[PDB]
């Protein structure tokens, strides 16, 4: 959460995390969602919309980030580590923004 807070997240529009909680590979995406839904992240910028899509037969956790550079970061995280997803997201958004 601190890494996202220190990075200046004012340049993002929409972050949605779509997942099925009843699967066996959801720990990482749940950790990522909790990291991006922290209060430091929320008070960094209020113009962003964070959505948590919950399904049952989707079975494919994924994250979509639409930000004002006209850019769409889609991440199909089914085996990725939570820290790896966090650092990749940070390094992409700071490079493009």
């Amino acid at each position: 959460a601190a890494a996202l807070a220190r990075l200046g997240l004012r340049a993002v529009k929409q972050v949605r995390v779509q997942f099925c909680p009843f699967e066996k590979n959801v720990e990482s995406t749940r950790t990522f969602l909790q990291a991006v839904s922290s209060e430091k992240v929320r008070c960094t910028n209020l113009n962003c919309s964070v959505i948590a899509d919950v399904r049952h037969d989707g079975s494919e956790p994924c994250v979509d980030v639409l930000f004002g550079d006209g850019h769409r970061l889609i991440m199909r995280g089914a085996h990725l580590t939570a820290q790896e997803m966090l650092t990749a997201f940070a390094s992409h958004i700071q490079a493009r923004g």
Partner: protein, 45 residues
């Protein structure tokens, strides 16, 4: 014992068999018994 499977609406096609057996029980009764059931349900519920 165990719990249910907790399915979803994406492929919802399996109904519990108790509903079907209750429907069969209603279908296998004569009109007088159906009227008696109607009277009992109106009195109680």
């Amino acid at each position: 014992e165990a719990l249910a499977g907790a399915p979803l609406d994406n492929a919802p096609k399996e109904y519990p068999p108790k509903i079907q057996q209750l429907v069969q029980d209603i279908a296998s009764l004569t009109l007088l018994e159906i009227s008696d059931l109607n009277e009992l349900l109106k009195k109680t519920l």
